Amino acid sequence: SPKEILNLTSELLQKCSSPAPGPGKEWEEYVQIRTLVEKIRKKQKGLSVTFDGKREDYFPDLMKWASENGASVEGFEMVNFKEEGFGLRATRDIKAEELFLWVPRKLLMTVESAKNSVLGPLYSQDRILQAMGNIALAFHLLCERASPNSFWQPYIQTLPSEYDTPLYFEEDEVRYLQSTQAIHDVFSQYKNTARQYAYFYKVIQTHPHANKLPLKDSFTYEDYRWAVSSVMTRQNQIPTEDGSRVTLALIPLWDMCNHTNGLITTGYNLEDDRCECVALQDFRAGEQIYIFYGTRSNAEFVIHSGFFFDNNSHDRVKIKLGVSKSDRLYAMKAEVLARAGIPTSSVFALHFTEPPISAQLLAFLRVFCMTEEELKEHLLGDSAIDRIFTLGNSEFPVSWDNEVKLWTFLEDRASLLLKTYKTTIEEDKSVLKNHDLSVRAKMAIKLRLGEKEILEKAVKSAAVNREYYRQQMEEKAPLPK
Amino acid sequence: QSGAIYVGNFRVVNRHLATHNDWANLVWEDSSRDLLVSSTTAQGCDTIARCNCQTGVYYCNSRRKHYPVSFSKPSLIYVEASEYYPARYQSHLMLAQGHSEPGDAGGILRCQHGVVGIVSTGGNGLVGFADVRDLLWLDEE
Ligand SMILES: [Zn+2]
């Protein structure tokens, strides 16, 4: 038990505990913390417990172990697909809605199970584990990994050694993401991971209740990083045993399926105390077994699941907007803000699918350029309740001048956002078609290209609607609404 | 899964499927929300979540299961006329994709911190949850 690692974690916690330094210097703070992370990583052995064989050699163990406990192991087989890695390949014809998967909870790994595990003494006193379910679940996975006589050890056997999450990025692969909004989320993720690792290694070394855990003998950055990455990439929500609350869970034999566009088809059957997944679509013989991971943007996909999906219709680019404190309509508009549920300032999303804008957006904008004379109509009158109800109705403009001003401001901000980026869309497409980059650089550059494409489409939509309203100005329509 | 929230000395359930006994013990109601609040003699075992999760789990009564779903923030959405409520303004309606057919109303959608709202509307592959976090008065006395 070397003492140098303790000082390294202490220094790391001290540095990362400070608030965000600001713009421009976030990069320098990132490289500083990455330097400390790298030095400690090469100061440790990495994976505390390593399986002698390869990942693909343990799948039959999963089949036998699950079959003994009533988890379906028929109708599919394990194959390493080149484009998404390991997955499930159907051994027969599966029709839509067909139920080919069910796993009893006994098999499932849950925060409650961790509370019933040897981690319970630590869970009792430490608040941090109490707050986030994923963190406690990750520590449960780590504790079970070092125990050869673990009921879930066959599950742990097949988990991949390394993933494609941002924590696996090198300085160049994060450099390719510079000037984009997602980099700030990468910053927050990496800083949180570092602070958690430092605090947790020091508590485990000092907390007496951790004496009996298998982690005390070896708690490296690689182990914690792998655990957090796995829980973050293959986690699903299930209710507590009593049914009072829901909690995070890792579902073996289900989360190993890849993602495709569609509708959620995974649900847990509390009455049977098991999780059942219905077929997302018709998977013929030899076709891959797909499921829907949720309605998350490609930015979240890259940050958490660890890959980028093409043709994703549910993508979005956070946009920071707000009303400056120097407008003469602040006091009168705050009444709507309070009554419209719209905060003073918050992060909004532009949607790739039509309509590009979102109700909460149409609302903030309608309140960002509207004139004063029209700012009391929604406050007084029998139509005030109807006006606030329809305040998000695109088909109901409050006024045509507010519309043209809104679309003007939208084009202005979108053009500013396009200018802000370091590179151009043409260069990105040429790099994708010409160069041969690694997978991680590949998804990073694809993410940047997708953000630029969504912004360009937003500019186009704003311009068409602005032209539409200008022609509507040349026209006469009696219905204001 | 009785189709209603039991907390404190109160009962929260959809207005359109409530019984006359609820109105006999009416303390507050709202037609625009399809939310009915009635007083209960017993003490409920459910806690109201005062957090802002946009992802939870809801019970699809038609399937006798519960599904995880990602829902939009509380906002006012047009609701098409049905056999029970004619099309009118409906506030505090969380909208998300899911299975919701007639009679599904009453399923509780649950996140980490507790109850957020209740399934109120369905159709066209869309599911509407009515918020209950706003009314802070709904707590122990
Ligand atoms: Zn919550």
Residue numbers in the entry:
A (entry chain B): 21 to 501
B (entry chain F): 6 to 146
What wording appears in the published article?
SETD3 is an essential host factor for the replication of a variety of enteroviruses that specifically interacts with viral protease 2A. SETD3 functions as an actin-specific histidine N-methyltransferase, and comprises an N-terminal SET domain and a C-terminal Rubisco large subunit methyltransferase (LSMT) like domain. The N- and C-terminal domains of SETD3 form a V-shaped central cleft, within which the actin substrate is recognized and methylated at residue H7318,19.
Specifically, SETD3 1−503 coexpressed with EV71 2A in insect cells was suitable for cryo-electron microscopy (EM) studies, and separately produced SETD3 1−498 and EV71 2A from E. coli were suitable for in vitro complex assembly and crystallization. The poor resolution of our X-ray diffraction data motivated us to switch to a single-particle cryo-EM approach for structural investigation. The coexpressed SETD3 1−503-EV71 2A complex from sf21 cells was suitable for sample vitrification and data collection. Although the molecular mass of this complex was only 73 kDa, we obtained a 3.1 Å cryo-EM density map providing further structural details. We could locate residues 21−501 of SETD3 and residues 6−146 of EV71 2A in the EM density. There are two discrete contacts between SETD3 and EV71 2A domain II, denoted Site-1 and Site-2. Comparing the two independently determined SETD3-2A complex structures showed that while the conformation of each component was highly similar (RMSD between the crystal and EM structures of EV71 2A was 0.49 Å, and that between SETD3 structures was 0.64 Å), their relative positions were slightly shifted, which contributes to the increased overall RMSD to 1.20 Å. We then aligned the crystal and EM structures with respect to SETD3, and identified a rotation between SETD3 and 2A. The rotational axis runs along the β-bII1 strand of EV71 2A, where 2A engages in an intermolecular antiparallel β-strand interaction with the SETD3 SET domain through two backbone hydrogen bonds. Structural variation between the crystal and EM structures reflects a degree of flexibility in the SETD3-2A interaction.
